[PDB]
């Protein structure tokens, strides 16, 4: 089926300490498999997955050396961004980065991602073509002019189309629960359809007793994790659609 890999890097400067805290988290198929934290014993890339433990010692040395590089990269830009926005000392700031590859059933890349955000808001992003940049603030114009004049897109394109899709394949060659549903009858009467113990989070509930879907009221909650590798969801006011289901459920 379809697969993916993502790296959520975060750097936060806080009034009180000299160097900002830097975290990097990796996901294979929307499941965490490795992490780095500059606040650790002595920071390094540790496995967060059962099937990741079999990686060579040379593998964690290169990855940890890279994270030290990103750390510095985030420390300089964070200082650069204070000037772009005419901020002074005293506040807390966040630079975030999301990169990754979505590949398909043919094992080839479908779309890569490279996107940055400052203070939680979008800052600059590599488009779907991997060649151009999208920048919203006028402060991000300085950056887009810098990167498109220093060939950043072509470098990131080489990672997305090369290292990303290659290594995600190697990770997957090292390693689908359907929901059990109930309905709560409690009258206030409002009905609630629960979907529990499914993986992945691909779920879709719906309320149609008359054959027509409902959005007037129809209060929902977005899929949330249970304390283990599953997820749950309920809907208010019951066909349940899931990738593991051969036929959507029916309960009333």
């Amino acid at each position: 089926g379809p697969h993916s890999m993502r790296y959520f890097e975060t750097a936060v400067s806080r009034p009180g300490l000299e160097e900002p805290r830097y975290i990097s988290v990796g996901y294979v198929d929307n499941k965490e498999f490795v992490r780095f934290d500059s606040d650790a014993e002595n920071p390094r890339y540790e496995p967060r997955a059962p099937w990741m433990e079999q990686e060579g010692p040379e593998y964690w040395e290169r990855e940890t050396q890279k994270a030290k590089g990103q750390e510095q990269w985030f420390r300089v830009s964070l200082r650069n961004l204070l000037g772009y926005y005419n901020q002074s000392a005293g506040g807390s700031h966040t630079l975030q980065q999301m990169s990754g590859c979505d590949l398909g059933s043919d094992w080839r890349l479908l779309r890569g991602y490279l996107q940055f955000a400052y203070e939680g808001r979008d800052y600059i992003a590599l488009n779907e073509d991997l060649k151009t940049w999208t920048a919203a603030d006028m402060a991000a114009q300085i950056t887009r002019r810098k990167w498109e004049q220093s060939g950043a897109a072509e470098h990131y394109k080489a990672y997305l189309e090369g290292e990303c899709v290659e290594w995600l394949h190697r990770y997957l060659k090292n390693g689908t629960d359907s929901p059990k549903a109930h309905v709560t009858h409690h009258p206030r009467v409002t009905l609630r359809c629960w979907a529990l113990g499914f993986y992945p989070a691909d779920i879709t509930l719906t309320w149609q007793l008359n054959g027509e879907e409902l959005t007037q009221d129809m209060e929902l909650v977005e899929t949330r994790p249970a304390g283990d590798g599953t997820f749950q969801k309920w809907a208010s006011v019951c066909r349940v659609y899931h990738e593991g289901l051969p036929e959507p459920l029916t309960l009333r």
């Binding site: 994270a67 830009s77 490279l114 990167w147």
Partner: peptide, 9 residues
């Protein structure tokens, strides 16, 4: 494998 940025902001 984690990416590795070139030019700063």
């Amino acid at each position: 494998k984690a990416p590795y940025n070139x030019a700063t902001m």
